[PDB]
Design an enzyme around this catalytic site. Structure first.
Site, PDB file in Angstrom:
ATOM      1  N   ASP A  34      -4.070   0.809  -5.737  1.00 42.77           N
ATOM      2  CA  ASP A  34      -2.696   0.655  -5.354  1.00 42.77           C
ATOM      3  C   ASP A  34      -2.040  -0.668  -5.793  1.00 42.77           C
ATOM      4  O   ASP A  34      -0.843  -0.677  -6.062  1.00 42.77           O
ATOM      5  CB  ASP A  34      -2.519   0.887  -3.853  1.00 42.77           C
ATOM      6  CG  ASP A  34      -3.372  -0.025  -2.948  1.00 42.77           C
ATOM      7  OD1 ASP A  34      -4.204  -0.805  -3.443  1.00 42.77           O
ATOM      8  OD2 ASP A  34      -3.223   0.102  -1.684  1.00 42.77           O
ATOM      9  N   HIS A  35      -2.833  -1.764  -5.797  1.00 41.16           N
ATOM     10  CA  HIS A  35      -2.368  -3.124  -6.059  1.00 41.16           C
ATOM     11  C   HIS A  35      -3.581  -4.051  -6.099  1.00 41.16           C
ATOM     12  O   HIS A  35      -4.662  -3.658  -5.722  1.00 41.16           O
ATOM     13  CB  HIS A  35      -1.343  -3.586  -5.007  1.00 41.16           C
ATOM     14  CG  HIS A  35      -1.857  -3.537  -3.622  1.00 41.16           C
ATOM     15  ND1 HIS A  35      -2.875  -4.354  -3.186  1.00 41.16           N
ATOM     16  CD2 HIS A  35      -1.591  -2.691  -2.614  1.00 41.16           C
ATOM     17  CE1 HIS A  35      -3.207  -4.017  -1.961  1.00 41.16           C
ATOM     18  NE2 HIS A  35      -2.433  -3.018  -1.582  1.00 41.16           N
ATOM     19  N   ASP A  94      27.052   3.919 -15.400  1.00 41.53           N
ATOM     20  CA  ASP A  94      28.297   4.186 -14.706  1.00 41.53           C
ATOM     21  C   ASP A  94      29.282   4.985 -15.533  1.00 41.53           C
ATOM     22  O   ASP A  94      29.457   4.737 -16.764  1.00 41.53           O
ATOM     23  CB  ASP A  94      28.995   2.839 -14.362  1.00 41.53           C
ATOM     24  CG  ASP A  94      28.278   2.043 -13.260  1.00 41.53           C
ATOM     25  OD1 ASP A  94      27.233   2.494 -12.684  1.00 41.53           O
ATOM     26  OD2 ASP A  94      28.821   0.936 -12.930  1.00 41.53           O
ATOM     27  N   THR A 133       0.770  -1.254   0.000  1.00 37.95           N
ATOM     28  CA  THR A 133       0.000   0.000   0.000  1.00 37.95           C
ATOM     29  C   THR A 133       0.798   1.300   0.000  1.00 37.95           C
ATOM     30  O   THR A 133       0.611   2.138  -0.886  1.00 37.95           O
ATOM     31  CB  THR A 133      -0.936   0.005   1.194  1.00 37.95           C
ATOM     32  OG1 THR A 133      -1.752  -1.142   1.075  1.00 37.95           O
ATOM     33  CG2 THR A 133      -1.809   1.217   1.238  1.00 37.95           C
ATOM     34  N   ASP A 159      26.402  -1.066 -14.374  1.00 35.35           N
ATOM     35  CA  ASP A 159      25.755  -0.517 -13.209  1.00 35.35           C
ATOM     36  C   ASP A 159      26.280  -1.154 -11.919  1.00 35.35           C
ATOM     37  O   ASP A 159      25.555  -1.819 -11.178  1.00 35.35           O
ATOM     38  CB  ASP A 159      24.208  -0.649 -13.318  1.00 35.35           C
ATOM     39  CG  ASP A 159      23.473   0.227 -12.328  1.00 35.35           C
ATOM     40  OD1 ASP A 159      24.046   1.219 -11.806  1.00 35.35           O
ATOM     41  OD2 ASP A 159      22.306  -0.090 -12.042  1.00 35.35           O
ATOM     42  N   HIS A 199      -8.191  -9.707   2.148  1.00 36.05           N
ATOM     43  CA  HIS A 199      -7.247 -10.429   2.965  1.00 36.05           C
ATOM     44  C   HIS A 199      -7.973 -11.566   3.716  1.00 36.05           C
ATOM     45  O   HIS A 199      -7.429 -12.629   3.817  1.00 36.05           O
ATOM     46  CB  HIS A 199      -6.583  -9.546   4.002  1.00 36.05           C
ATOM     47  CG  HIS A 199      -5.443  -8.743   3.491  1.00 36.05           C
ATOM     48  ND1 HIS A 199      -4.187  -9.279   3.302  1.00 36.05           N
ATOM     49  CD2 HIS A 199      -5.336  -7.423   3.231  1.00 36.05           C
ATOM     50  CE1 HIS A 199      -3.375  -8.331   2.890  1.00 36.05           C
ATOM     51  NE2 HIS A 199      -4.030  -7.191   2.895  1.00 36.05           N
TER      52      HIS A 199
HETATM   53  C1  LIG Z   1      -3.186   4.832   2.866  1.00 33.17           C
HETATM   54  N1  LIG Z   1      -4.089   5.678   3.651  1.00 33.17           N
HETATM   55  C2  LIG Z   1      -4.489   5.464   4.955  1.00 33.17           C
HETATM   56  C3  LIG Z   1      -4.021   4.331   5.661  1.00 33.17           C
HETATM   57  N2  LIG Z   1      -3.572   3.392   6.115  1.00 33.17           N
HETATM   58  C4  LIG Z   1      -5.330   6.506   5.258  1.00 33.17           C
HETATM   59  N3  LIG Z   1      -5.445   7.360   4.181  1.00 33.17           N
HETATM   60  C5  LIG Z   1      -4.683   6.835   3.239  1.00 33.17           C
HETATM   61  C6  LIG Z   1      -4.532   7.433   1.876  1.00 33.17           C
HETATM   62  O1  LIG Z   1      -3.256   8.089   1.577  1.00 33.17           O
HETATM   63  C7  LIG Z   1      -3.007   8.456   0.271  1.00 33.17           C
HETATM   64  C8  LIG Z   1      -4.003   8.464  -0.685  1.00 33.17           C
HETATM   65  C9  LIG Z   1      -3.682   8.832  -1.972  1.00 33.17           C
HETATM   66 CL1  LIG Z   1      -4.961   8.851  -3.139  1.00 33.17          CL
HETATM   67  C10 LIG Z   1      -2.376   9.175  -2.337  1.00 33.17           C
HETATM   68  C11 LIG Z   1      -2.032   9.547  -3.684  1.00 33.17           C
HETATM   69  N4  LIG Z   1      -1.726   9.875  -4.736  1.00 33.17           N
HETATM   70  C12 LIG Z   1      -1.398   9.162  -1.356  1.00 33.17           C
HETATM   71  C13 LIG Z   1      -1.676   8.791  -0.043  1.00 33.17           C
HETATM   72  C14 LIG Z   1      -0.573   8.811   1.031  1.00 33.17           C
HETATM   73  C15 LIG Z   1      -0.553   7.480   1.815  1.00 33.17           C
HETATM   74  C16 LIG Z   1      -0.888   9.962   2.019  1.00 33.17           C
HETATM   75  C17 LIG Z   1       0.833   9.017   0.460  1.00 33.17           C
HETATM   76 CA   LIG Z   2      -3.135  -1.565  -0.214  1.00 30.74          CA
HETATM   77 CA   LIG Z   3      25.250   3.171 -11.980  1.00 32.40          CA
HETATM   78 ZN   LIG Z   4      -3.618  -5.389   1.964  1.00 30.31          ZN
END
Ligand SMILES: Cn1c(C#N)cnc1COc1cc(Cl)c(C#N)cc1C(C)(C)C
Ligand SMILES: [Ca+2]
Ligand SMILES: [Ca+2]
Ligand SMILES: [Zn+2]
Ligand SMILES: *[C@@H]1O[C@H](CO)[C@@H](O[C@@H]2O[C@H](CO)[C@@H](O[C@@H]3O[C@H](CO[C@H]4O[C@H](CO)[C@@H](O)[C@H](O[C@H]5O[C@H](CO)[C@@H](O)[C@H](O)[C@@H]5O[C@H]5O[C@H](CO)[C@@H](O)[C@H](O)[C@@H]5O)[C@@H]4O)[C@@H](O)[C@H](O[C@H]4O[C@H](CO)[C@@H](O)[C@H](O)[C@@H]4O[C@H]4O[C@H](CO)[C@@H](O)[C@H](O)[C@@H]4O)[C@@H]3O)[C@H](O)[C@H]2NC(C)=O)[C@H](O)[C@H]1NC(C)=O
Ligand SMILES: [Cl-]
Ligand code: NA
Ligand code: NA
Length: 802
Positions: free
Chosen positions: A307-308, A689, A158, A681, A264
């Site tokens: 995210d994934h 390099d 995440t 590298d 999960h």
């Molecule tokens: C992961 N998380 C939790 C927990 N556990 C509570 N709130 C979030 C969302 O945070 C984000 C949401 C977005 Cl959309 C982007 C982007 N681009 C970046 C973040 C971070 C994490 C602040 C870097």
């Molecule tokens: Ca996640």
């Molecule tokens: Ca290098």
């Molecule tokens: Zn997860």
């Protein structure tokens, strides 16, 4: 914290207040520092989240979570379904899709706002498989711009991915290299639970919210406190959007913990997953109905992104390091879907990484992880150049976990996890862009999440901080606000040496047994050496050298090369193999033949004697002698300027690529053009390099040893046209192979190469852009295609997944 200042008038304030003044911004909860009345004033719930017929036209009552009174729209705090319930308007999802040609925004908006809607663990195939229960999301997808999937970064956790989205950077550059970390400079640990993760020294680069602010653009919060309900996040965004022009942010983020949280517990497709998808879709409808109420539904750009993904993993598919190592209590493992190993204690000088690797290497016949020194990981992962990444790494097979010993796992809970290799299908996620700046009903190819920061900046009129995106490679997502890059300027112009040296000026230790003698074919070999076939072999122009160096262009019947006088070998070698080409063997009169190149001085050449003395190191050729066009041309492949240093273990790989695979690809793709060369590298930063970085030479010489060998294999996307006569878009696959003195990586390597080389090569697939960073070259300089289209091609990754 003096927590009896008030939050009245200040709920979800955008600017933070300094201690001991109590905070009303979210985060206050995560720092245990809210004013006393925060929940009472800022987290109202009375009467829930929807208007009903009875509530229509009601008298405002400030206790309510949202409002159904007449003043609510001007106040910006109506329940999201207010016009539907009280005014006979339709839900956004029930309206036909209408192209948004231009932003249709209220007066005073200087640019379309951007809302990032990020959904944790939303695997790519949920868009098709959950289509029947996600009507809001399906409307976004089919009316906007979407990709079949988006590739996350490794590891597919995440924070690394969300911080990549925010920064345009690889985890190794932004610093968030995992969900848990040890930094030895700080001697500090980062964890999900708790408060050290909030310290700013973890978080490198410049995230979007800071880029925005530095350039005069206001931003809503990115982090939402887990206790704040989704309906409240939505309403808070809608409220901010009702702010006056000088206070109103232009960029917003919404985050959902679902579907990851259920995923999960139940696995990616457990029957319990249907409800979390329904609930996310409802939240999207709330936002869109809310936008429509405020007349912003054809004004905002919305990015729906994950995210994934999520894969099936259970307790019983755990590998235990205690089954491999007897020294198991001398180490610390970061466990799970990846492994990272370091010494339990740094005063234990007994500890030896090579014996750990050796004990973890091909020990059980179905072993479901593979140990790597981090510099030897696939370069596509970009997962090495950070002190927080431990030197020893375990790449875990999909569906599996690694733990240190079985008490760690039984002291079963879960059916899904993520974190694996970022090319794995189950880890892929989603992208949808919807709004005036995005295209209408358009599908785009899969791309990497590192690219979005640049786009988000484009959407907001910002100049992006330096990042790992390739700015312009996603112009084809955008109706307008494209970024129009120019090709980088060539720094070094090549020399074009003619014949300047006699044979007897070279003392190389090289035998070639080749003395045997026409005037038709004398002007014929002359013209090949002056570049007559060069249009056949150099299809997309010569690569441009983007740094200061000394090099030569060398022409030949079958291949062309840029030969480095500093590194004593080619930076690149380019050749085309048609569908019709034949393979021949290396004849006996030429097996250990190496011939002086009379265009290049003895002093800027390699020599055979260094190889003879170097008992570990042998040599191969960049243009493969197997594919020479004629017996006369085959002599050219034995020039000393076509030779490179190769370990005999790597020659097994290289020979098989050159002898079998190239011809296979030419048959399958209707000709290919190949550009091959070396990569240095030694400090594993993913960048070329300088000569003074090179750590290994061929014994007794100045011939530097590559860490890797690359090839770029280009053909016509419409494969009915031959590679050398292609009218339209191109098709590329590439690799960056590690130049290793053993084949320990390939567990099956005692078998014939047809059982394991191709598998190795696929693991080390690469983008053209990765090779550019590593070599300082810029490819595809002279095509008939637009530059943005070539930028997209340069970011393509051939993943070999189904
Ligand atoms: C992961 N998380 C939790 C927990 N556990 C509570 N709130 C979030 C969302 O945070 C984000 C949401 C977005 Cl959309 C982007 C982007 N681009 C970046 C973040 C971070 C994490 C602040 C870097
Ligand atoms: Ca996640
Ligand atoms: Ca290098
Ligand atoms: Zn997860
Ligand atoms: C992906 O994109 C990114 C972004 O473009 C690329 O990363 C950049 O690569 C640049 C080239 O390597 C690099 O430039 C160096 O910057 C040094 C100054 O750095 C600080 O300031 C910047 C700007 O605000 C900031 O971004 C940096 O942030 C890093 O460091 C902190 C903590 O250390 C982290 O919180 C943060 O996450 C980030 O870490 C990452 O970068 C560092 C390296 O900078 C890594 O070590 C980490 O692991 C992590 O990956 C910094 O706060 C500057 O000092 C360098 O200059 C040297 O080089 C030449 C040599 O000729 C010389 O002119 C200079 O004087 C200097 O040499 C002297 O110092 C040497 C080293 O100490 C010494 O050995 C010599 O003897 C000399 O005396 C250099 O310009 C830039 O910082 C990063 N930026 C980021 C954000 O990572 C990345 O390459 C891309 N990846 C690919 C594959 O393309
Ligand atoms: Cl991790
Ligand atoms: Na040798
Ligand atoms: Na092996």
């Amino acid at each position: 914290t003096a927590t009896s200042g008030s939050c009245k008038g200040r709920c979800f304030e955008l600017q933070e207040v300094g201690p001991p003044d109590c905070r009303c911004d979210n985060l206050c909860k995560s720092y245990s520092s809210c004013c006393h009345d925060f929940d009472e004033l800022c987290l109202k719930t009375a009467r829930g989240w929807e208007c009903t017929k009875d509530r229509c036209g009601e008298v405002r009552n400030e206790e309510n979570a949202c409002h159904c009174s007449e003043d609510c729209l001007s106040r910006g705090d109506c329940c999201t379904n207010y016009q539907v319930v009280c005014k006979g308007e339709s839900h956004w999802v029930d309206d036909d899709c209408e192209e948004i040609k231009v932003p249709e925004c209220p007066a005073g908006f200087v640019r379309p706002p951007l809302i990032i809607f990020s959904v944790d663990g939303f695997r790519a195939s949920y868009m098709k498989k959950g289509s029947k229960v996600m009507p809001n999301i399906e409307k976004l997808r089919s009316c906007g711009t979407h990709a079949p999937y988006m590739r996350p970064v490794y590891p597919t956790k995440t924070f690394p991915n969300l911080y990549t989205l925010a920064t345009g950077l690889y985890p190794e550059s932004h610093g968030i290299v995992g969900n848990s970390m040890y930094d030895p400079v700080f001697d500090a640990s980062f964890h999900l639970r708790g408060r050290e993760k909030f310290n700013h020294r973890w978080w490198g680069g410049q995230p979007l919210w800071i880029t925005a602010t530095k350039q005069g653009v206001r931003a809503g919060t990115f982090f939402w406190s887990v206790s704040i309900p989704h309906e409240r996040r939505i309403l808070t965004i809608l409220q901010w959007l009702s702010l006056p022009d000088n206070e109103r942010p232009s960029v917003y983020a919404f985050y959902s913990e679902q579907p990851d949280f259920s995923g999960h517990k139940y696995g990616p497709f457990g029957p319990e997953m249907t409800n979390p998808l329904r609930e996310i879709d409802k939240t999207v409808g709330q936002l869109m109905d809310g936008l429509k109420q405020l007349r912003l539904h054809r004004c905002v750009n919305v990015i729906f992104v994950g995210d994934h993904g999520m894969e099936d993993v259970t307790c019983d598919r755990t590998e235990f390091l205690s089954n491999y190592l007897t020294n198991v209590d001398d180490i610390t493992l970061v466990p799970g879907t990846l492994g990272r190993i370091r010494a339990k204690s740094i005063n234990n000088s007994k500890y030896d990484p090579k014996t750990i690797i050796a004990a973890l290497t091909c020990k059980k016949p179905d072993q479901h992880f593979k140990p790597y020194m981090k510099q030897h990981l696939p370069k596509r992962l970009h997962y090495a150049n950070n002190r927080r990444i431990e030197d020893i790494h375990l790449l875990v097979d999909r569906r599996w976990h690694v733990a240190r010993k079985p008490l760690d796992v039984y002291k079963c809970f879960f059916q899904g996890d993520h974190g694996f290799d970022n090319k794995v299908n189950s880890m892929q996620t989603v992208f949808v862009g919807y709004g005036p700046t995005f295209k209408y009903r358009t599908k785009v190819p899969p791309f990497e999440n590192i690219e979005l920061y640049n786009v988000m900046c484009d959407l907001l009129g910002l100049k992006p901080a330096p990042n790992n995106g390739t700015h312009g490679s996603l112009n084809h997502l955008l109706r307008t606000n494209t970024f129009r890059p120019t090709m980088p300027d060539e720094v070094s112009r090549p020399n074009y040496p003619g014949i300047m040296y006699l044979q007897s000026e070279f003392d190389l230790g090289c035998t070639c047994d080749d003395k045997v003698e026409n005037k038709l074919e004398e002007l014929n070999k002359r013209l090949h050496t002056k570049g007559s076939t060069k249009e056949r072999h150099l299809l997309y122009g010569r690569p441009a050298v983007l740094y200061r160096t000394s090099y030569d262009i060398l022409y030949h019947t079958d291949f062309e090369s840029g030969y480095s006088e500093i590194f004593l070998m080619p930076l690149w070698t380019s050749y085309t193999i048609s569908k019709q080409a034949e393979v021949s063997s290396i004849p006996e009169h030429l097996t250990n033949c190496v011939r002086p190149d009379v265009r290049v001085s003895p002093g800027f050449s390699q020599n055979c004697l260094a190889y003879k003395n170097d008992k570990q190191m042998s040599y191969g050729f960049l243009f493969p002698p197997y594919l020479s066009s004629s017996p006369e041309a085959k002599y050219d492949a034995f020039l000393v300027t076509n030779m490179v240093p190769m370990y005999p273990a790597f020659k097994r790989v290289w020979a098989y690529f050159q002898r079998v695979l190239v011809k296979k690809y030419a048959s399958e793709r209707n000709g290919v053009n190949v550009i091959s060369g070396p990569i240095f590298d030694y400090n594993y930063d993913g960048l070329r390099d300088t000569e003074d970085e090179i750590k290994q030479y061929v014994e007794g010489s100045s011939i530097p040893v590559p860490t890797h060998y690359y090839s770029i294999i280009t053909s016509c996307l419409d494969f009915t046209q031959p590679a050398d006569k292609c009218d339209g878009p191109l098709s590329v696959s590439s690799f960056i192979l590690p130049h290793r003195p053993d084949n320990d990586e390939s567990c099956n390597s005692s078998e014939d190469e047809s059982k394991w080389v191709e598998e190795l090569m696929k693991m080390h697939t690469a983008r053209v852009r990765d090779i550019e960073h590593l070599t300082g070259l810029d490819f595809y300089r002279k095509t008939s295609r637009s530059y943005s289209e070539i930028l997209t091609l340069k970011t393509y990754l051939h993943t070999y997944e189904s």
